[PDB]
Amino acid sequence: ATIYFSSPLMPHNKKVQAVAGKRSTLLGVAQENGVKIPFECQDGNCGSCLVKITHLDGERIKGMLLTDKERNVLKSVGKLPKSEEERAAVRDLPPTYRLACQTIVTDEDLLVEFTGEPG
Amino acid sequence: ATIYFSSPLMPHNKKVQAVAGKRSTLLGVAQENGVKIPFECQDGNCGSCLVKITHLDGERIKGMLLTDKERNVLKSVGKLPKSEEERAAVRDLPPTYRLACQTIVTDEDLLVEFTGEPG
Ligand code: FES
Ligand code: FES
């Protein structure tokens, strides 16, 4: 799994190859590789490890695989919730906010952005 | 790989093991094992094959892996959108509406309900 770390405190992005599987947190992978993601708590409530994750691999919008044509057919019958109509219509590849200490790294490739501030 | 077909037209649900792979459709396994899911069109815009799918396997809310604790941290910093909270906070295992001729079978197990009327 390839992870690209990015942050205003790093003049260069860091490309990291992380072995999928063996028990690892996105924050753990970062600190092995010298990416300073703020880490102030052991209980996972401080929020300082907040990262903005873009999924480079896999599904564009995770867990929603419908074609544009299947989604419009279900709208002529009223069969798509309104909340899933808005999600699928995003033009930009949507980012997900996570806490790195709570995020377990899998085979997928990721772009991981963080401000660098302990906040 | 295991799909449970259910419908008011059958007093018994039908348990089917269908081999996975990306070239097979949910409606194909249905007729092939004899459920009679209404199949009225070749181009997939009629909507008659509409099914209600509950995912028995895998992630509870597809594409949302946050623990309840991680969602509380992100919502407290305003980093969790209200429409992604709504998805994760559901009490009941949420159903997904799909067109059976547009749904491609994977290894994950499914319960698939359909009304039985050709619509
Ligand atoms: S380090 Fe405190 S929440 Fe991740
Ligand atoms: S048969 Fe018309 S949508 Fe599947």
Curated annotation (Swiss-Prot), chains A, B:
Impact noted for substituting residue 15 to A: Decreased protection of nitrogenase
Compartments, record wording: Cytoplasm
Main location: cytoplasm
Any Gene Ontology CC annotation: cytoplasm
Description of the deletion phenotype: No visible growth phenotype, but shortly after entry into stationary phase the nitrogenase subunitsare destabilized and are no longer detectable. In vitro nitrogenase is highly sensitive to O(2).
Region: N-loop, residue numbers: 58-95
Cross-referenced InterPro entries: 2Fe-2S_ferredoxin-like_sf, 2Fe-2S_ferredoxin-type, 2Fe2S_fd_BS, Beta-grasp_dom_sf
One Gene Ontology term from the biological process aspect of the record: nitrogen fixation
Sorted UniProt keywords: 2Fe-2S, Chaperone, Cytoplasm, Iron, Iron-sulfur, Metal-binding, Nitrogen fixation
Induction cue: Expressed in nitrogen-fixing and non-nitrogen-fixing cells, although transcript levels are higher in nitrogen-fixing cells. Expressed during log and stationary phase growth (at protein level). The gene is monocistronic.
Residues annotated for [2Fe-2S] cluster binding in this entry: 41, 46, 49, 101
Cofactor(s) in the UniProt record: [2Fe-2S] cluster
Pfam family name, one: Fer2
UniProt GO molecular function: 2 iron, 2 sulfur cluster binding; metal ion binding
Cofactor note: Binds 1 [2Fe-2S] cluster per subunit.
Residue ranges constituting the 2Fe-2S ferredoxin-type domain according to the UniProt record: 1-118
Family indicated by similarity: Belongs to the adrenodoxin/putidaredoxin family.
Subunit field text: Homodimer. Forms a complex with nitrogenase consisting of 1 MoFe heterotetramer, 1 Fe protein dimer and 1 FeSII dimer; the interaction is electrostatic and disurpted by increasing NaCl levels.
Entry remark concerning the domains of this protein: Has mobile N-loop (residues 59-96) that changes position in a redox-dependent manner being folded against the protein in the closed reduced state, protecting its [2Fe-2S] cluster, or away from the protein in the open oxidized state. The open form complexes with the MoFe and Fe subunits of nitrogenase protecting them from O(2).
Function of the protein: Binds to and protects nitrogenase from irreversible exposure to O(2), in what is known as 'conformational protection'. Shifts nitrogenase into an inactive, O(2)-tolerant state. Exists in 2 states, an open oxidized state that binds and protects nitrogenase, and a closed reduced state that probably does not bind nitrogenase; cooperative oxidation of the 2Fe-2S clusters causes the conformation change. Does not protect nitrogenase with the vanadium-iron subunit, not clear if it protects the iron-only nitrogenase.
Name of protein: Protein FeSII
